[PDB]
Design a protein around this ligand. Structure first.
Ligand SMILES: CC(C)CCC[C@@H](C)[C@H]1CC[C@H]2[C@@H]3CC=C4C[C@@H](O)CC[C@]4(C)[C@H]3CC[C@]12C
Ligand SMILES: CC(C)CCC[C@@H](C)[C@H]1CC[C@H]2[C@@H]3CC=C4C[C@@H](O)CC[C@]4(C)[C@H]3CC[C@]12C
Ligand SMILES: Cc1ccc(-c2ccc(F)cc2COc2ccc(CCC(=O)O)cc2)cc1
Ligand SMILES: Cc1ccc(-c2ccc(F)cc2COc2ccc(CCC(=O)O)cc2)cc1
Ligand SMILES: [K+]
Ligand SMILES: [K+]
Ligand SMILES: [K+]
Ligand SMILES: [K+]
Ligand SMILES: [K+]
Ligand SMILES: [K+]
Ligand SMILES: [K+]
Lengths: 412, 412
């Protein structure tokens, strides 16, 4: 027997990488109807693959909530499970790119079946050696019924996908219906490990923050030949020619880091994460993945006022979507504060107002910039930049600002 | 005050991404002297940037060993520190690509100075609020001397790099000498947080395992137009045309996952990690980063026997270098087992032989394949594939094999 914490941390790292894999085609899209259609398709594929990989990650998290402690064989089986999961984005992209070809849907169904079969092997091994189970399962007298329930839950998806794979040769629409039913059944018809949620969130945030510097380190180191021919041997000029990329990276890193800061602060006060909090966290991460695209678009900065106005609106919308779901997590937690939140941030608690301000800082700023874009259109672009400067400072001075507001309302 | 564990986990994730960033140019190198020179330059740059980012990560780890507990201001300062660190690979690549241009060396020195200045701000803030310090520092009466020592250690590198930046305008070789002195002084003239080492290692392993699938998901989804024109509308043929990439990914993921399995097993029994163990871990990770290149080269599989023999030798050498340093970590730990290892894996312990076999499995296999390449040249290539099949199975049956060997030696 061994402690399973590090194995699950490795699983979370791999799964965050796999979930965010499909954001690279979006950010590498150079950017007339054809280009817009291509970008929309890529964004939709990214969202769907992120959600699918998140569903797989959640299934893994609760599977290894059932399995309390790990073992060499369990570690190798988990490696096999991760290997199978790493193919979901590619097979899904292949299926959507070739909807009418049965081979793509068959490959996706095979990937899902393989994940389920490896997880069923893990469940069988763990139940054959009860000391690997959680104490709740170990001490229960209905271990056989627990095994049946867990194994049925694990193998539900594989059965539906196997039926879909069969039907692909006869009636494709029913195959797609079964694939969607796979995701529908678990949620249309419990707590989630807070550590797993935190690890997955940290991985996603770390990847999204550094996407643009990863692009820069590969593409934007000047070529000495190009420097000597096109910039008259001036390295400073060659580096200035690529300024917009650096500005995009700075903005994206700052925004993603501050959103992670808000998430970190929120989860420092969470006692237990519910399923609703997990769903809202998934939505927030999915929309967070899109910030690099927003900042690329705004940094490119086509001089046309209408184009730049559209870019600012899109960026503000993306930031609002990223942060409103964190605020929604916090509001959902407040409904069951007694069991979900530490007493510090309960209604009327010491740090309740500070947490509220910290989580509402970004949605308010994004909404204000978006409104300025409609009311103060000419200044709006500058206002957007002002936002990028104001929000970080507000985070530094947040306690002083909250105290000032409290003192002001004391008399008012 | 807040718990600093999640902030440091996020730092480890970001730092692993930044350390492994420069491996992408290596794996994206399509592969006459010019190509070899380009590949050698890219590999050297990757190694140097990995080592530099690891030095920065180690400095960060011990800085936040000094700082016991975190705070909102400390969290934001840490975000700024990570932002500064993310520019080390790009500035180093720019400096090496333009060695004679003072601007590149100046930018690298500025990045180093900025990292040091942010860390000095963190130290000053933590010491101005002693409750953020570790209890050892808090209870000491020499907190002023501790502050002086820590601040000097933090600002050592910035001073040397500032001198180098000045000298770049007058005598460049002395500037380079000072830059190397920055790294020389700390090591030429203590324990390391095992959690930080584990998190960094897991991040690096997770990135390296999935490099090739990240490439595949972007580049190798067939284009319907290409499928219809070049493969006569056969999607299976189009997918078979890209088989070697999938084989390379399978091999690379299996090898990296099993090396991580060996690392995980080793560190499950480590009580405290010393500086020597940290250095050996860094070397092992640096050489692990090169496995995707080895497997790409072997999967490309030019039919020429000499070329394939060279590619098998290179792959075996890379695997041996990756795993021998894990074995060296284990051997170094055995020298101070009493304080470094759990009693289970001490000399003559219950699991000592199993740990030895687990860590020596890969070096022995790689050395045997390399030797077969010289003695059994014609079969060697097949033997390499045999290795890819044998080592995983040996990991599954490792306990049975160890028991069999013990029983055999009982009579012999
Ligand atoms: C053929 C390979 C490539 C992939 C598909 C594997 C097949 C044989 C597996 C995957 C999941 C399995 C199913 C999982 C659960 C159940 C429910 C049980 O009450 C009857 C058997 C049934 C319906 C299984 C039959 C076999 C099954 C469909
Ligand atoms: C100019 C900007 C862009 C970058 C460089 C910042 C300069 C001013 C900073 C960076 C590190 C600093 C040094 C850090 C440590 C010491 C040792 C002390 O006994 C004398 C001052 C001295 C030598 C500092 C002088 C100022 C310094 C060199
Ligand atoms: C109905 C059905 C059909 C097929 C499969 C199946 C098939 C292939 C496969 F690889 C794994 C599985 C499932 O994996 C196990 C299931 C049970 C057991 C032990 C039994 C116990 O005591 O509960 C061990 C492993 C399962 C159930
Ligand atoms: C000799 C020298 C020269 C320059 C700098 C410097 C310069 C710029 C900068 F941003 C930060 C620093 C260093 O950051 C601090 C140092 C001390 C203090 C408080 C003093 C205490 O009580 O020890 C707080 C912050 C430091 C030492
Ligand atoms: K973690
Ligand atoms: K991670
Ligand atoms: K990553
Ligand atoms: K990448
Ligand atoms: K971790
Ligand atoms: K990581
Ligand atoms: K290309």
């Amino acid at each position: 027997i061994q402690c399973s914490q590090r194995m699950l941390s490795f699983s979370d790292a791999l799964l965050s990488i796999i979930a965010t894999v499909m954001i690279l085609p979006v950010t590498h899209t150079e950017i007339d109807r054809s280009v817009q259609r291509l970008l929309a398709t890529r964004i939709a594929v990214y969202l769907m693959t992120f959600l699918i990989v998140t569903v797989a990650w959640a299934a893994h998290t609760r599977l290894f909530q059932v399995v309390g402690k790990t073992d060499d064989t369990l570690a190798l089986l988990n490696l096999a499970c991760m290997m199978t999961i790493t193919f979901l984005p590619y097979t899904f992209s292949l299926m959507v790119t070739f909807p009418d070809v049965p081979l793509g849907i068959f490959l996706f169904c095979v990937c899902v079946i393989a994940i389920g079969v490896v997880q069923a092997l893990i469940v069988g091994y763990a139940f054959h050696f009860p000391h690997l189970l959680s104490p709740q399962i170990q001490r229960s007298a209905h271990r056989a019924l627990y095994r049946r329930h867990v194994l049925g839950i694990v193998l539900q998806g594989p059965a539906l996908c196997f039926a879909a794979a069969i039907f692909s040769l006869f009636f494709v629409p029913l195959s797609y219906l079964l694939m969607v039913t796979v995701i529908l059944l678990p949620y249309v018809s419990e707590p989630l490990s807070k550590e797993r949620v935190e690890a997955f969130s940290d991985g996603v945030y770390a990847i999204v923050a550094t996407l643009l510097i990863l692009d820069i380190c590969e593409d934007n180191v000047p070529d000495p030949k190009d420097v000597k021919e096109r910039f008259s041997g001036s390295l400073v000029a060659a580096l200035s020619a690529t300024g917009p990329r650096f500005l995009a990276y700075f903005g994206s890193f700052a925004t993603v880091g501050l959103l992670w800061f808000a998430h970190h602060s929120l989860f420092l006060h969470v006692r237990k994460a519910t399923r609703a909090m997990g769903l809202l966290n998934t939505l927030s991460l999915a929309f967070v993945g899109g910030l690099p695209l927003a900042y690329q678009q705004t940094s490119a900065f086509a001089r046309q006022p209408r184009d730049e106005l559209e870019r600012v609106r899109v960026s503000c919308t993306i930031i609002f979507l990223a942060s409103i779901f964190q605020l929604a997590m916090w509001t959902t937690a407040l409904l069951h504060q007694a069991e979900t939140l530490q007493p510090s941030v309960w209604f009327g608690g010491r740090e309740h107002v500070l947490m509220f301000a910290k989580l509402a800082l970004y949605p308010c700023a994004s909404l204000l910039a978006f409104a300025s874009t409609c009311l103060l259109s000419r200044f709006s672009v500058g206002i957007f930049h002002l936002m990028q400067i104001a929000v970080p400072c507000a985070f530094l001075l947040l306690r002083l600002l909250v105290g000032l507001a409290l003192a002001t309302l004391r008399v008012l």
